[PDB]
Amino acid sequence: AMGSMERASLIQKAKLAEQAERYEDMAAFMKGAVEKGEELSCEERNLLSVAYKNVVGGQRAAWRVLSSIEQKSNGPEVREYREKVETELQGVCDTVLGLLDSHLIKEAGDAESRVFYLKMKGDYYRYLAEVATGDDKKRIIDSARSAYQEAMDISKKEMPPTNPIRLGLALNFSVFHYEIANSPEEAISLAKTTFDEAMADLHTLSEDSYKDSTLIMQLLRDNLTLWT
């Protein structure tokens, strides 16, 4: 649908849509930019991720409200409307996963891009897992786990322990363990080891990098405080 707009204009409009808090537009512009077929720069990857995180975040919040009302009730309207929102959410997750599979991951050869996209793949399978209840729930969970694990393996070989992408990947994989995989001890161990290894590498960083890394380390600590 964005095929007639220049790549650079789609990127410019995605930035304007972010300023205007028009995240559905932002996601459509960034989908159009991906579909031009060129690899994404670091800033463009961040625009893609922010756009879809906001879209799916609103859907997840609505699904949780409706799911809570439905569980309290147990006419067809609450279930029907929860199902409508759930289908829309699944459609957005499938769209993101489709962009990653056609063809962002296969062309991503640098550690920073490949880890970023595999973390995204884990995240969007995780959002699918949050609403899954059928015969594929196990397979959806395994798909999230596999994507996160490949990203972790690359990040540990190629990035320092303070790298913000590495830290955010570990944070989200720990949330996967706690919330999806019923593995709270694995979640706590991963968050603790990630935090401690980052702490020991802070001395290597500039003031600005220190700020970036310590911000995410505080999120790991916040989860550890809630989980212990």
Partner: peptide, 9 residues
């Protein structure tokens, strides 16, 4: 609990 909020570029 909290994943990366991820909602501001």
């Amino acid at each position: 609990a909290g994943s990366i909020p991820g909602r501001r570029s």
